[PDB]
Design a protein around this ligand. Sequence first.
Ligand code: HEM
Ligand code: HEM
Ligand code: HEM
Ligand code: HEM
Lengths: 141, 141, 146, 146
Amino acid sequence: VLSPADKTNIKSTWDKIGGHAGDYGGEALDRTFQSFPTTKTYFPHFDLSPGSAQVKAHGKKVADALTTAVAHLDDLPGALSALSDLHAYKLRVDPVNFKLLSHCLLVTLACHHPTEFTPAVHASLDKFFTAVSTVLTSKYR
Amino acid sequence: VLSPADKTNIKSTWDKIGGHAGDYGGEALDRTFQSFPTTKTYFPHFDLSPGSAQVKAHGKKVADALTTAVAHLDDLPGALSALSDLHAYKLRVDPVNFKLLSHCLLVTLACHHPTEFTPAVHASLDKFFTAVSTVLTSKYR
Amino acid sequence: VHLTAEEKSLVSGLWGKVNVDEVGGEALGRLLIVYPWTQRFFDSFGDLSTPDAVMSNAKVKAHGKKVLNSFSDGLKNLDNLKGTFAKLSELHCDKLHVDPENFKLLGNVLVCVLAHHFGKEFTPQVQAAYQKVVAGVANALAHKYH
Amino acid sequence: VHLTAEEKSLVSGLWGKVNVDEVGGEALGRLLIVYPWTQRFFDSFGDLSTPDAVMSNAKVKAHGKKVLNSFSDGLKNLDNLKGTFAKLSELHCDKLHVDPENFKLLGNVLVCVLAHHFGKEFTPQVQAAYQKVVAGVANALAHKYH
Ligand code: HEM
Ligand code: HEM
Ligand code: HEM
Ligand code: HEM
């Protein structure tokens, strides 16, 4: 639903990660590929090694899209519509994979910002990631 | 989403079920209780045997709520708001249960109307039941 | 997988009337239509874009018959589903990387196809027995992930 | 569960620094907060309504310590998680009727709690090893449904 406290928790946390967002995107992908091998299947054209330039560069793209979402919490469907077509129509990503990546994104944030990672902040971010995943899979429903 | 074709398939199918909706609601619950025993946990006050008057009566209420939804495909959140509170806030139904019931609702319609149950109709109905479940669990996210 | 003697009779009794040439293609076809992301695994099958295309696709009908035959093998060896599907478990997990959740989705649409074909003979009791079998097969197939 | 030699070392190495009196309560507390429907199983625990009510709830802290100790047991018996959790499998399935999906959710928030506590030491490599253990425990506990 995304309530005022939620939005506040999301904006505040993103403000903290700031210039590190891109790095976090790359790290979260690494965590996803290592923890859930089935996900590597969507990136056959990638050198899926650990500090790879391709993984790092893609992580920056993912982090940028999330930053755009943070700026448009009121209209996620509008802000992410192009990405919705890409994921549903062209890539045909299994919905289950979004949960796996979302989990690794939370772990990455927990690792780097333990102090702001309170139970309330954890619940707001999970709501945020679940909201983004829903929009990126909306063409299936 | 629910495209114009989906809505047409949903309205047209409900029109055919018609006066049998209530019966179908009771039969789908029966199929749910027998197929997935974990669901009986939410109904300790019910005599959960097969012909039961309690099960039948409850099925009529479930069927009536779905008929209301069919009449308000453009505003499911508004039409089902009270039920959203009931299920999320009061009963605290595990989201997984909605899939189980939705499946048995589809099986019940397939059993009774094999001719209308085309691949296209099956897909639209699935979208419908998933849309209803999402609204009934919207207070969790 | 348990299946009390009565359940085994319900299952086998219905399965003897199943047209294995039709049911398999119908179940796979509906999976591709209802859950679109599954089409990614069947790139090599040709045209799948519309419901009609999927339902007239010869590769879909042919592969479906194969999927159905495997189920018939599991039904004869209900107490050792694990061994029966060990090799196929490795295929789907290792070479195909199909998420297990999809095994449960195919099992569920198979149940819908049987209901569609048998009407009222597919009673709540018969469905319950089949829900157990379908969960058993999904389980055995997901073994190489456990 | 596999857990190659190196993974075993990464897992047990970090577990030795885990404060079992803290982590268990923190993981259960967050599960109740992040996934609200889980509160239904803990009606006997008193006030859960707010995040701080959950975090100061004595029964939550006490039960969490118990859940954590059984995990410690599974870590010693990595070979036979199945037998180690057979009795608990019966409880959660038989008497509790907790859907297995929730075992996976608790496992994942435990991973979040470890990451929160260890920071950098909880590398992608360490997480991967723990993701395998947590999936293993969830599967051993869901055994009574297979
Ligand atoms: C929160 C969810 C996610 C976000 C915000 C996201 C965002 C994006 C963005 C911004 C792009 C770049 C588009 C381009 O330049 O081509 C992209 C591409 C893509 N995404 Fe995601 N994505 C998400 C989840 C997923 C998931 C779960 C998978 C599958 C494991 C996935 C697979 C891909 C692939 C295969 C591409 C093409 C990458 C390439 O060719 O460089 N995405 N995604
Ligand atoms: C398509 C989804 C569903 C619909 C439309 C539906 C609809 C309703 C309605 C109309 C009521 C009746 C309230 C009244 O007495 O006026 C209700 C009550 C209830 N529902 Fe559902 N429901 C759905 C899914 C679920 C699921 C999946 C469960 C759990 C297994 C569930 C458990 C209950 C319970 C325990 C009650 C109280 C029944 C009683 O004591 O009379 N519902 N629901
Ligand atoms: C749950 C029941 C399932 C059973 C019993 C089953 C059975 C089979 C069988 C018998 C084959 C052997 C074909 C060969 O000789 O190569 C096969 C292949 C395959 N299966 Fe499955 N399968 C199941 C689920 C799935 C699901 C859900 C997907 C993915 C959405 C899938 C994807 C594949 C693919 C891509 C192949 C290769 C097809 C080809 O290249 O012709 N299967 N499966
Ligand atoms: C990693 C997964 C889990 C583990 C290892 C675990 C472990 C345990 C243990 C050790 C106990 C018994 C305590 C004793 O010795 O007396 C227990 C009890 C229980 N568990 Fe879990 N559990 C798991 C997941 C869950 C989940 C997901 C739920 C439900 C949402 C749940 C609900 C309960 C309840 C209600 C009880 C006992 C009720 C009471 O003591 O009043 N557990 N669990």
